[PDB]
Amino acid sequence: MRAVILVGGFGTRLRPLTLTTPKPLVPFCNKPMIIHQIEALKAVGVTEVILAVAYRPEAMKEQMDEWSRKLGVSFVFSVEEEPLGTAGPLALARDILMQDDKPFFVLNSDVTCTFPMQELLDFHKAHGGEGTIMVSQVTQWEKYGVVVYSPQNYQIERFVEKPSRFLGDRINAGIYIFNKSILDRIPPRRASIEKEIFPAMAAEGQLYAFNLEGFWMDVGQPKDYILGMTKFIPSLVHGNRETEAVEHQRGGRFTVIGASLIDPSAKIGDGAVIGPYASIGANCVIGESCRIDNAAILENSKVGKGTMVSRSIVGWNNRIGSWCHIKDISVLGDDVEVKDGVILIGTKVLPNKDVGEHRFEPGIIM
Amino acid sequence: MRAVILVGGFGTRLRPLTLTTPKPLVPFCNKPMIIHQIEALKAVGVTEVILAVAYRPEAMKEQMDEWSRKLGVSFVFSVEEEPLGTAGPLALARDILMQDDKPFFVLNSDVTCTFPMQELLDFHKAHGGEGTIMVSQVTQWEKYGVVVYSPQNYQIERFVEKPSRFLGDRINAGIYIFNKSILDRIPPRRASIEKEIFPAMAAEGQLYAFNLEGFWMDVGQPKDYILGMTKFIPSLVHGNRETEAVEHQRGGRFTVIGASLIDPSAKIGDGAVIGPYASIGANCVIGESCRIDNAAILENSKVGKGTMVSRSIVGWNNRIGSWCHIKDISVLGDDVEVKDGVILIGTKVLPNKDVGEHRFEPGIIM
Ligand SMILES: Nc1nc2c(ncn2[C@@H]2O[C@H](COP(=O)(O)OP(=O)(O)OP(=O)(O)O)[C@@H](O)[C@H]2O)c(=O)[nH]1
Numbered sequence A, B: 001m002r003a004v005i006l007v008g009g010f011g012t013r014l015r016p017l018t019l020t021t022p023k024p025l026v027p028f029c030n031k032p033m034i035i036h037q038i039e040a041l042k043a044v045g046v047t048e049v050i051l052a053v054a055y056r057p058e059a060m061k062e063q064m065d066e067w068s069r070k071l072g073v074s075f076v077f078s079v080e081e082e083p084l085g086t087a088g089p090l091a092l093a094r095d096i097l098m099q100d101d102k103p104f105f106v107l108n109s110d111v112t113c114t115f116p117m118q119e120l121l122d123f124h125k126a127h128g129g130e131g132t133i134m135v136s137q138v139t140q141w142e143k144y145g146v147v148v149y150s151p152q153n154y155q156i157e158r159f160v161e162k163p164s165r166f167l168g169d170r171i172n173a174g175i176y177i178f179n180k181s182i183l184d185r186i187p188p189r190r191a192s193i194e195k196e197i198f199p200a201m202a203a204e205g206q207l208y209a210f211n212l213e214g215f216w217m218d219v220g221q222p223k224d225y226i227l228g229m230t231k232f233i234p235s236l237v238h239g240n241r242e243t244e245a246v247e248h249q250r251g252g253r254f255t256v257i258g259a260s261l262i263d264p265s266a267k268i269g270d271g272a273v274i275g276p277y278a279s280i281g282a283n284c285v286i287g288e289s290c291r292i293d294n295a296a297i298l299e300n301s302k303v304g305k306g307t308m309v310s311r312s313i314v315g316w317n318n319r320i321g322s323w324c325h326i327k328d329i330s331v332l333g334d335d336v337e338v339k340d341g342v343i344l345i346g347t348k349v350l351p352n353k354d355v356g357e358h359r360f361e362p363g364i365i366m
């Protein structure tokens, strides 16, 4: 059995970070998102993964996906295309899917969860998609705006965008399983599985919902990125090698106030405070008395002594000043450098910039 | 004789347009900037041009520079590198320059002028650089911040940044001519010609200034892009095939208020008003009653009927609404689509966005 991961898309909401690498390859915790999904699929037993590459065709996806050497998994990489929407890549890859009898998985590269994939053995009871429209309970379904009306029969009546009445709380979770006959329904053109194929499947009564018991988060926005990190790190602390601690003696003496993820190659200064649900990338350097409250530090980033970055993301090769505060939901680009004493309250800095001025209001640094 | 054009750099000031293509390849009027410079160099008699390619090593610069088939000129493309500053590429290309007796040109991909290149035959009077630090008279030298003190002996005393006293009005013009011995001075590392090599040359007394009689503009910024286009189009109106008109009967019946540049393949509405110093790209479609006041329309961009874009730049594959107003200095990305009735007053929109809200103040749309 094989899977198909939608690895295209421009990453508009995660723009300051996706101007350098595609959205699937943006490191979540200490690994790319697609790597988490591929690890889950391999744990299931899927050996073949089909990547629908539109953004950065060969510059980034093919080169950086050397993980095929690891993980004992192989990627087809034969869905190179122009932008064909969410559903078009399946129409393009109908040939490589071979239209075999065995169903196939479909995933978005932006969803994080416990990945309960027992929907393979389960939900085979006469479904066009074996519980394909997997749904998660969110109390904020107004702003999410994609509500799935799943009854006890699991037959999807309709899809409602921003419904006024309390039709339901379940929302789409971005994980699907399809019988290959769906390849006949999808036309060879730009289309959206969410707004074209799925309403038709719901009308025909071949669309079935799957309830998600565990946590779920679509980490495709910086705020959702931070909150998904908070939800996810506690699950992964015992999974990996990264008292109230996860990595408490990596460099000198520093304090951890809960779950975190510090790479073995990262250097942490003396008296630093790596706070709860914080990620430190490889080869990263952290100053003496830094405070990484809820921040993600990516790759070869350097943070000076006394800096406090909280609920914020910093790019791959930053050089943060000494006594800075990067607060709120602030995202830094690939090679941003911040001078000492600069305060960034939820400001997004584009790659290859130098910041030397305080910004106390949310905004964008060109 | 051979030239070296510094085609690297991240294009930070032209960021909304340089997130898709490198700064040299950003179309100025109806051609890339580097193409204007290469045409001037070919008019000189220069056959070899060496491009210092750092940004987009092979994705854009090598593929898009198919102009080598045209123009009767050849480019070396042997300076692929990591970011080495403004002076380092010369050290890297020392080997391909062969250290021959003949001098060589140096140019930036951000400058537009009449290109007086008679500085080859002139200024040979015992100069390390034959009038290498070419200077132009600008009354706004304070904000430009690079003032060159050129006396009647043309020996550069010093370089002053934001001078309080009126030392001089001449500023750097970005065109240089060096004897190959300078390759010994430049170290094989990241350096800047403007802030490392040039002060040393001025102190040594081997730096000579060349005055620029004609117009000049560093068009690396959208405001400077628009103003330099205004300065430049009157020079090029008679040069190319694009009463008080330049292209007055291309599509239907429309009015031209002055100099402009309308590509032969562009269809220009019916009753539209293509204003003074306006550029319309190839395959572009213009609505019935548009007002292209001082705007540049790039490539396959479509503009609806009644839209008024003034002193603004639209991207390559835009789809502008019908009754919009894109005023002030506004820059649109590669694939921005604007809904009908939207007003953008000097707002920079990143590529692959959809604009549906009025923005009456300068800002950035992520
Ligand atoms: N292959 C491919 N996948 C896509 C495309 N557009 C979206 N996707 C997938 O859809 C999921 C989420 O969409 P993204 O493109 O990441 O998010 P976005 O950039 O805000 O754009 P949309 O969600 O499409 O409005 C991700 O799995 C994407 O990989 C596309 O044009 N081609």
Ligand SMILES: Nc1nc2c(ncn2[C@@H]2O[C@H](COP(=O)(O)OP(=O)(O)OP(=O)(O)O)[C@@H](O)[C@H]2O)c(=O)[nH]1
Pocket (backbone or CB within 6 Å): B005, B006, B007, B008, B009, B010, B011, B012, B013, B023, B052, B053, B054, B083, B084, B085, B086, B089, B107, B108, B109, B110, B220
């Ligand atoms: N090869 C190369 N050329 C550069 C580099 N940086 C600047 N240049 C050249 O210097 C000129 C103007 O600089 P740009 O980089 O375009 O402008 P910018 O992006 O605002 O950055 P700076 O002017 O360098 O501060 C252009 O000719 C560039 O090609 C570089 O790192 N490598």
Ligand SMILES: [Mg+2]
Pocket (backbone or CB within 6 Å): A108, A110, A111, A218, A219, A220
């Ligand atoms: Mg998403």
Ligand SMILES: [Mg+2]
Pocket (backbone or CB within 6 Å): B108, B110, B111, B218, B219, B220
């Ligand atoms: Mg410039």
